Amino acid sequence: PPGEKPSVFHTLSRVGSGCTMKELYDLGLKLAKYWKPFHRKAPPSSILCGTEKPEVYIEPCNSVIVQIKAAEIVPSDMYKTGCTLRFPRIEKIRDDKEWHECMTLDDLEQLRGKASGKLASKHLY
Amino acid sequence: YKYSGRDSLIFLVDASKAMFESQSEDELTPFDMSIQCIQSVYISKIISSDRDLLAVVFYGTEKDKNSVNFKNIYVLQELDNPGAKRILELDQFKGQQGQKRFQDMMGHGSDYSLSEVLWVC
DNA sequence: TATATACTAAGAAC
DNA sequence: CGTTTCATTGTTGTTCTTAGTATATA
DNA sequence: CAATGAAACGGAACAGTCAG
């Protein structure tokens, strides 16, 4: 709702490329004190999970926004969004953005339906 | 050794209140001694082996910045080819007025841990 | 007084 | 299949050139 | 002293298997 911050998050895809190892080490040091072991029989309420489960989870308020560039949005039975990202990698670690500034399922659906799942629909000039 | 490789010397001084104002007598001062040593060696390295790398990084300070945002560590000038723009930065601290500047800009000297100092250098 | 002969000291070329 | 990282081949320092100024010599 | 190359990896998706 207006003025409020999101409380429930839906997993979309796994990403592990695009950052230099120095950036990865910096992010790991930043987030180390917030990671919690993930229990399949007792998952967190703020993070629902599909078929794919993480080894450790972090509460959204302590996490970091990452800018992701991926070939297209394709259907998936491993993530609750009903879809995942093809060829995903991290372009920037959005330290200028807050955790609550993450996009919504409405934005994800808009992007999926803009060009039949293809995320490239703008001409080059 | 591999010729294109280059020598690299990093400088690391105890920034605690221990030696900041030890000055048992009035003829020397360990910080005024360590900084003098750093300035001398670094100016010599300017002319000698200008291709090499030097860096100065203080530990135990109260202000903080480093690569990993740790506690009580200050990387004054990073590793890079030597230059005057850093001769001046070091010279800014040479003096009783200079030590006043150093203390009121980074700190009297807080708690520390040389483990984390070795980790960061 | 004119001429070149000497030198070093530059240069840049490779 | 795409992205990232690493390692290696081109890199040059030195010699010679000309300069410039130097002076005394005829 | 670095551009150029690799190699190393990071999932993406598939199916067969084994547990149960």
Coordinates of C-alpha atoms (C1' of nucleotides) in Angstrom, one line a residue:
Chain A
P1 CA 0.0 0.0 0.0
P2 CA 1.1 3.6 -0.4
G3 CA 3.7 4.7 2.1
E4 CA 4.3 1.1 3.1
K5 CA 7.3 -1.2 2.2
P6 CA 6.9 -4.7 0.7
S7 CA 6.9 -7.7 3.1
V8 CA 6.5 -10.8 0.9
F9 CA 8.9 -11.6 -1.9
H10 CA 8.6 -14.1 -4.8
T11 CA 11.8 -15.7 -6.1
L12 CA 12.6 -15.2 -9.8
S13 CA 16.0 -16.6 -10.7
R14 CA 19.5 -17.4 -9.5
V15 CA 22.4 -15.2 -10.5
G16 CA 26.1 -15.7 -9.9
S17 CA 28.0 -13.9 -12.6
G18 CA 28.7 -10.3 -13.6
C19 CA 30.6 -9.1 -10.5
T20 CA 34.4 -9.0 -10.1
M21 CA 35.6 -11.2 -7.2
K22 CA 36.6 -8.0 -5.3
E23 CA 33.0 -6.9 -5.5
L24 CA 31.8 -10.4 -4.5
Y25 CA 34.1 -10.4 -1.5
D26 CA 32.9 -6.9 -0.5
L27 CA 29.2 -8.0 -0.8
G28 CA 29.9 -11.1 1.2
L29 CA 31.6 -9.2 4.0
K30 CA 28.7 -6.7 4.0
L31 CA 26.0 -9.4 4.2
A32 CA 27.9 -12.0 6.3
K33 CA 26.2 -11.0 9.6
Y34 CA 22.7 -11.3 8.2
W35 CA 22.6 -14.8 6.6
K36 CA 20.5 -17.4 8.3
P37 CA 20.4 -21.1 7.6
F38 CA 17.5 -22.1 5.4
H39 CA 15.1 -24.8 6.7
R40 CA 12.8 -26.4 4.2
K41 CA 10.5 -27.5 7.0
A42 CA 10.5 -24.0 8.5
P43 CA 10.9 -21.4 5.7
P44 CA 10.7 -17.6 6.4
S45 CA 7.4 -15.9 5.8
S46 CA 8.9 -12.9 4.0
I47 CA 10.6 -15.1 1.5
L48 CA 8.4 -17.8 -0.1
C49 CA 10.2 -20.4 -2.2
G50 CA 9.3 -22.5 -5.3
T51 CA 11.0 -25.8 -6.1
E52 CA 14.5 -24.2 -5.8
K53 CA 15.6 -23.6 -2.2
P54 CA 18.6 -21.6 -1.1
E55 CA 21.3 -22.8 1.3
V56 CA 21.0 -19.6 3.4
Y57 CA 18.5 -16.8 3.4
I58 CA 18.6 -13.2 4.3
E59 CA 15.8 -11.0 5.5
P60 CA 14.8 -8.4 2.8
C61 CA 15.5 -5.3 4.9
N62 CA 19.2 -6.4 5.2
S63 CA 19.7 -7.4 1.6
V64 CA 21.0 -5.5 -1.5
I65 CA 19.4 -4.7 -4.9
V66 CA 21.2 -6.0 -7.9
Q67 CA 20.7 -4.9 -11.5
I68 CA 20.2 -7.9 -13.7
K69 CA 20.4 -8.2 -17.5
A70 CA 19.1 -11.4 -19.0
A71 CA 18.2 -12.5 -22.5
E72 CA 14.5 -13.1 -22.0
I73 CA 11.8 -14.2 -19.5
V74 CA 11.0 -17.9 -20.0
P75 CA 8.6 -20.2 -18.2
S76 CA 9.9 -22.0 -15.2
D77 CA 8.6 -24.7 -12.7
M78 CA 11.5 -23.9 -10.3
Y79 CA 10.4 -20.3 -9.2
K80 CA 7.1 -19.2 -7.9
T81 CA 6.8 -16.3 -10.4
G82 CA 6.1 -19.0 -13.0
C83 CA 9.1 -17.8 -14.9
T84 CA 12.9 -17.3 -14.7
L85 CA 15.6 -15.4 -16.6
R86 CA 17.6 -16.7 -19.5
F87 CA 21.3 -16.0 -19.5
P88 CA 21.3 -13.8 -16.3
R89 CA 24.2 -11.8 -14.9
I90 CA 24.7 -8.9 -12.6
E91 CA 25.3 -5.6 -14.3
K92 CA 25.6 -3.4 -11.2
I93 CA 25.3 -3.8 -7.5
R94 CA 22.7 -1.1 -6.8
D95 CA 24.0 0.4 -3.6
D96 CA 22.2 3.6 -4.5
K97 CA 18.8 1.8 -4.2
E98 CA 17.1 0.6 -1.0
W99 CA 15.8 -2.9 -0.5
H100 CA 12.2 -1.8 -0.7
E101 CA 12.9 -0.2 -4.1
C102 CA 12.8 -3.7 -5.7
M103 CA 10.3 -4.1 -8.5
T104 CA 6.9 -5.8 -8.1
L105 CA 5.1 -8.7 -9.7
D106 CA 3.2 -6.1 -11.7
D107 CA 6.4 -4.8 -13.2
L108 CA 7.6 -8.3 -13.9
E109 CA 4.3 -9.1 -15.7
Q110 CA 4.5 -5.9 -17.7
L111 CA 8.1 -6.8 -18.8
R112 CA 7.1 -10.4 -19.6
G113 CA 4.1 -9.3 -21.7
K114 CA 5.7 -6.3 -23.5
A115 CA 7.5 -8.4 -26.1
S116 CA 6.3 -12.0 -25.6
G117 CA 8.9 -12.6 -22.9
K118 CA 11.7 -11.0 -24.8
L119 CA 13.3 -8.2 -22.8
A120 CA 14.8 -6.6 -25.9
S121 CA 12.2 -4.5 -27.7
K122 CA 13.9 -1.2 -28.5
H123 CA 15.6 -0.3 -31.8
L124 CA 19.2 0.8 -32.1
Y125 CA 19.8 4.3 -33.4
Chain B
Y1 CA 62.8 -12.4 -10.9
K2 CA 60.3 -11.5 -13.6
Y3 CA 61.6 -8.1 -14.9
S4 CA 58.2 -6.5 -15.7
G5 CA 57.3 -7.2 -12.1
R6 CA 58.0 -4.4 -9.6
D7 CA 58.9 -3.9 -6.0
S8 CA 56.0 -3.0 -3.6
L9 CA 56.4 -1.6 -0.1
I10 CA 53.5 -0.8 2.1
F11 CA 53.7 1.4 5.2
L12 CA 51.9 0.8 8.4
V13 CA 52.3 2.8 11.6
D14 CA 50.8 2.4 15.0
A15 CA 48.3 5.2 15.3
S16 CA 47.4 4.6 18.9
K17 CA 47.9 7.2 21.7
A18 CA 50.9 5.0 22.6
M19 CA 53.5 6.6 20.4
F20 CA 51.5 9.6 19.1
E21 CA 52.7 11.6 22.1
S22 CA 55.2 9.4 23.8
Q23 CA 57.9 12.1 23.8
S24 CA 59.8 11.0 26.9
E25 CA 62.3 13.8 26.2
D26 CA 61.8 16.8 23.9
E27 CA 64.3 15.9 21.2
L28 CA 62.3 13.3 19.1
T29 CA 58.9 11.8 18.7
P30 CA 58.2 8.3 17.3
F31 CA 55.4 9.5 15.0
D32 CA 57.6 12.4 14.0
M33 CA 60.2 9.6 13.6
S34 CA 58.2 7.1 11.7
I35 CA 56.7 9.8 9.4
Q36 CA 60.2 11.2 8.8
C37 CA 61.4 7.7 7.9
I38 CA 58.4 7.2 5.5
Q39 CA 58.9 10.6 3.9
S40 CA 62.7 10.0 3.4
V41 CA 62.4 6.5 2.0
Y42 CA 59.5 7.5 -0.3
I43 CA 61.2 10.6 -1.7
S44 CA 64.3 8.5 -2.3
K45 CA 62.2 5.9 -4.1
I46 CA 60.8 8.7 -6.3
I47 CA 64.1 9.1 -8.0
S48 CA 65.5 5.6 -7.5
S49 CA 62.8 3.2 -8.8
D50 CA 60.0 5.5 -10.0
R51 CA 58.4 2.4 -11.6
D52 CA 57.7 0.7 -8.2
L53 CA 54.8 0.9 -5.8
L54 CA 54.4 2.3 -2.3
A55 CA 51.4 2.8 0.1
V56 CA 50.8 4.2 3.6
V57 CA 48.1 2.9 5.8
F58 CA 47.6 3.6 9.6
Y59 CA 46.0 1.3 12.1
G60 CA 44.2 1.9 15.4
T61 CA 42.8 5.2 14.3
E62 CA 39.3 6.4 15.1
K63 CA 38.0 7.6 11.7
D64 CA 37.7 4.7 9.3
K65 CA 38.0 3.9 5.7
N66 CA 39.5 0.9 3.8
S67 CA 38.4 -1.6 1.2
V68 CA 36.3 -3.6 3.5
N69 CA 35.0 -0.9 5.9
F70 CA 36.6 -2.3 9.0
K71 CA 37.3 -0.8 12.4
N72 CA 40.3 1.5 13.3
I73 CA 42.1 1.2 9.9
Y74 CA 43.0 4.1 7.6
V75 CA 44.5 3.6 4.1
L76 CA 46.1 7.1 3.8
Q77 CA 47.3 6.6 0.2
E78 CA 46.7 3.4 -1.7
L79 CA 49.2 1.4 -3.7
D80 CA 50.3 3.3 -6.7
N81 CA 53.3 4.6 -8.5
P82 CA 55.0 7.2 -6.3
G83 CA 54.4 10.9 -6.9
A84 CA 54.5 14.4 -5.4
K85 CA 50.8 14.5 -4.8
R86 CA 51.6 12.2 -1.9
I87 CA 54.9 13.7 -0.9
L88 CA 52.7 16.6 0.1
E89 CA 50.1 14.4 1.9
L90 CA 52.8 12.9 4.0
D91 CA 54.4 16.3 4.6
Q92 CA 51.1 17.6 5.9
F93 CA 51.5 15.6 9.0
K94 CA 55.2 16.5 9.8
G95 CA 55.0 18.8 12.8
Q96 CA 53.4 19.4 16.2
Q97 CA 50.8 21.4 14.4
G98 CA 50.8 18.5 11.9
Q99 CA 50.2 15.9 14.7
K100 CA 47.4 18.1 15.9
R101 CA 45.9 17.9 12.5
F102 CA 46.4 14.1 12.3
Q103 CA 44.8 13.5 15.7
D104 CA 41.8 15.7 15.1
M105 CA 41.3 14.3 11.6
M106 CA 41.7 10.6 12.2
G107 CA 41.9 10.1 15.9
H108 CA 43.8 9.8 19.2
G109 CA 44.2 6.1 18.6
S110 CA 41.5 3.6 19.5
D111 CA 41.6 -0.2 20.1
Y112 CA 43.0 -2.3 17.3
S113 CA 44.0 -5.9 16.2
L114 CA 47.0 -6.6 14.1
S115 CA 45.2 -9.7 12.7
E116 CA 42.8 -7.3 11.0
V117 CA 45.7 -5.1 10.1
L118 CA 47.4 -8.0 8.3
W119 CA 44.1 -9.1 6.7
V120 CA 43.6 -5.6 5.3
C121 CA 47.2 -4.9 4.1
Chain C
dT1 C1' 89.4 40.8 -39.0
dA2 C1' 87.7 36.6 -41.0
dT3 C1' 87.4 31.7 -41.1
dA4 C1' 87.2 27.0 -39.4
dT5 C1' 88.2 24.1 -36.4
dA6 C1' 86.7 21.9 -31.5
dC7 C1' 84.0 21.1 -28.3
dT8 C1' 80.2 19.9 -25.9
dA9 C1' 75.9 19.7 -25.8
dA10 C1' 72.2 19.1 -27.1
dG11 C1' 68.6 16.1 -30.2
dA12 C1' 65.9 11.6 -32.2
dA13 C1' 66.4 8.0 -34.1
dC14 C1' 66.1 3.2 -34.0
Chain D
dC1 C1' 26.2 -21.2 -23.8
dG2 C1' 27.9 -16.8 -21.9
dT3 C1' 31.1 -14.3 -18.7
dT4 C1' 35.0 -13.6 -16.4
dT5 C1' 40.1 -14.1 -15.6
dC6 C1' 45.0 -14.9 -16.9
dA7 C1' 49.0 -15.0 -19.9
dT8 C1' 51.3 -13.8 -23.3
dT9 C1' 53.3 -10.8 -27.4
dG10 C1' 54.9 -5.7 -28.3
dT11 C1' 57.5 -3.2 -25.7
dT12 C1' 62.4 0.0 -25.8
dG13 C1' 66.9 2.5 -24.1
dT14 C1' 71.0 3.6 -26.5
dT15 C1' 73.8 5.5 -30.2
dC16 C1' 74.4 8.4 -33.4
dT17 C1' 73.1 13.4 -35.4
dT18 C1' 72.7 17.7 -35.5
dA19 C1' 73.0 21.2 -33.1
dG20 C1' 75.2 25.0 -30.9
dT21 C1' 78.7 27.4 -29.0
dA22 C1' 83.4 27.3 -28.2
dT23 C1' 87.8 29.3 -29.2
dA24 C1' 92.1 30.3 -31.4
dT25 C1' 94.5 30.7 -35.9
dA26 C1' 95.9 32.6 -40.3
Chain E
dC1 C1' 52.6 -2.8 -20.2
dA2 C1' 48.8 -4.3 -22.1
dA3 C1' 45.4 -6.3 -25.7
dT4 C1' 44.1 -10.9 -27.0
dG5 C1' 42.9 -15.3 -26.0
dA6 C1' 40.8 -19.9 -22.6
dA7 C1' 39.4 -21.6 -19.5
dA8 C1' 37.0 -21.8 -16.3
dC9 C1' 31.8 -21.6 -14.3
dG10 C1' 27.4 -20.7 -14.2
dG11 C1' 23.5 -21.9 -14.6
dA12 C1' 19.1 -24.5 -18.0
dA13 C1' 17.2 -27.8 -19.1
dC14 C1' 16.5 -32.7 -19.5
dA15 C1' 15.4 -38.1 -17.4
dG16 C1' 16.6 -41.5 -15.4
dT17 C1' 17.1 -43.4 -11.0
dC18 C1' 16.4 -44.3 -6.4
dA19 C1' 13.9 -43.7 -2.4
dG20 C1' 10.1 -44.0 -0.3

